[PDB]
Design a protein around this ligand. Structure first.
Ligand SMILES: *C/C=C(C)/C=C/C=C(C)/C=C/C1=C(C)CCCC1(C)C
Ligand SMILES: CCCCCCCCCCCCCCCCCCCC
Ligand SMILES: CCCCCCCCCCCCCCCCCCCC
Ligand SMILES: CCCCCCCCCCCCCCCCCCCC
Ligand SMILES: CCCCCCCCCCCCCCCCCCCC
Ligand SMILES: CCCCCCCCCCCCCCCCCCCC
Ligand SMILES: CCCCCCCCCCCCCCCCCCCC
Ligand SMILES: CCCCCCCCCCCCCCCCCCCC
Ligand SMILES: CCCCCCCCCCCCCCCCCCCC
Ligand SMILES: CCCCCCCCCCCCCCCCCCCC
Length: 265
């Protein structure tokens, strides 16, 4: 199946790798719940014209809280301690670790995260429906092809890499469209608003690039390096969690700050 089950069925996990991963994943969903309350409670601070962004952030928080909670429970319940060896091994009586929860989260959140910026910034020469459709089509194809490649993570590294490269092509199209959105959105707003948009662009670029980084984490030191191990599992789930918080919560906070700044003439 996946790299997590592979390690869990062969080498097992140290108490530390199992506990660290349970805690990071728990922090992930905990932050989404806090984010949910923040976006609901702050909806009254922005003008009505911009409230769709707060609404879409709130919906992303529900998606991410529920699905990361389900992933967290799946992690903790999938491995059981062996006293002889002193490690956690995959439990054949369990469901086994499943990355489906995260990929479904991506399928839901990606279209809403890309769409929500179009309720805060104004385009100039691009059409709203064109940009929206390109975001949605490429976003969906990114996640779908990456999901396909994930099936080959352990069994066929070649297909894993090829499908990931196909997915990356759609990713680069998204980055290209978003860069245009940001540049049109900077036209005729105040310098304070332009500086927030510049920050949004940088946050977007870095935080979205973390996802492919985590997808490749166990192979980033070769076919038998330091990360082809429980340490690469830990690193993968840490980087996902940093990306989750950044791409969903911080991105949303910054858009709301942009909407407040735009209310000032
Ligand atoms: C909260 C969720 C978000 C922002 C999810 C974003 C997911 C991606 C940017 C996925 C990207 C991928 C690649 C560009 C190549 C490797 C396969 C993916 C699906 C991880
Ligand atoms: C510009 C407004 C000031 C920024 C406030 C950001 C608040 C984000 C709320 C969610 C973060 C919760 C983190 C702790 C959970 C554990
Ligand atoms: C307008 C008040 C802001 C409330 C902060 C959001 C609550 C985070 C919970 C942790
Ligand atoms: C449309 C926003 C809500 C999306 C929720 C997705 C379904 C949650 C399933 C959690 C259990 C699996
Ligand atoms: C069309 C493929 C998009 C990715 C969806 C992944 C669906 C996973 C469903 C979770 C199953 C939990 C058991
Ligand atoms: C307005 C938001 C429309 C896209 C949300 C659903 C994303 C695809 C879920 C499958
Ligand atoms: C300059 C305004 C702040 C931009 C960065 C905010 C998020 C930093 C990481 C937390
Ligand atoms: C599009 C491929 C991007 C791979 C870059 C890896 C950076 C990840 C940081 C961990
Ligand atoms: C914009 C948020 C800051 C990104 C920090 C990148 C963390 C990389 C962790 C690497 C672990 C190996
Ligand atoms: C004018 C721009 C100001 C942007 C402030 C951005 C800072 C957001 C702070 C929320 C981050 C919460 C992360 C908690 C993880 C533990």
């Amino acid at each position: 199946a996946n790299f997590e089950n592979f390690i869990g069925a062969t080498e097992g996990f140290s108490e530390i790798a199992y506990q660290f991963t349970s805690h990071i994943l728990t922090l992930g969903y905990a932050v989404m719940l806090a984010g949910l309350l923040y976006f609901i409670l702050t909806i009254k601070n922005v003008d009505k014209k911009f409230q769709m962004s707060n609404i879409l952030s709130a919906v992303v928080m529900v998606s991410a809280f529920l699905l990361l909670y389900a992933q967290a429970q799946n992690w903790t319940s999938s491995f059981t301690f062996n006293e002889e060896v002193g490690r956690y091994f995959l439990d054949p009586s369990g469901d086994l670790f499943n990355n489906g929860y995260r990929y479904l989260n991506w399928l839901i959140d990606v279209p809403m995260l890309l769409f929500q910026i179009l309720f805060v910034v104004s385009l100039t020469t691009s059409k709203f429906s064109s940009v929206r459709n390109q975001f949605w089509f490429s976003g969906a194809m990114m996640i779908i092809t990456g999901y396909i490649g994930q099936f080959y993570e352990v069994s066929n590294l070649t297909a894993f890499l090829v499908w990931g490269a196909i997915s990356s092509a759609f990713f680069f199209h998204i980055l290209w469209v978003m860069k245009k959105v940001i540049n049109e959105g900077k036209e005729g707003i105040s310098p304070a608003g332009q500086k927030i948009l510049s920050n949004i662009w940088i946050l977007f670029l870095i935080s979205w690039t973390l996802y492919p980084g985590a997808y490749l984490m166990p192979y980033l030191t070769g076919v038998d390096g330091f990360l082809y191990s429980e340490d690469g599992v830990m690193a993968r789930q840490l980087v996902y969690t940093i990306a989750d918080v950044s791409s969903k919560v911080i991105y949303g906070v910054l858009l709301g700050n942009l909407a407040i700044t735009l209310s000032k003439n």
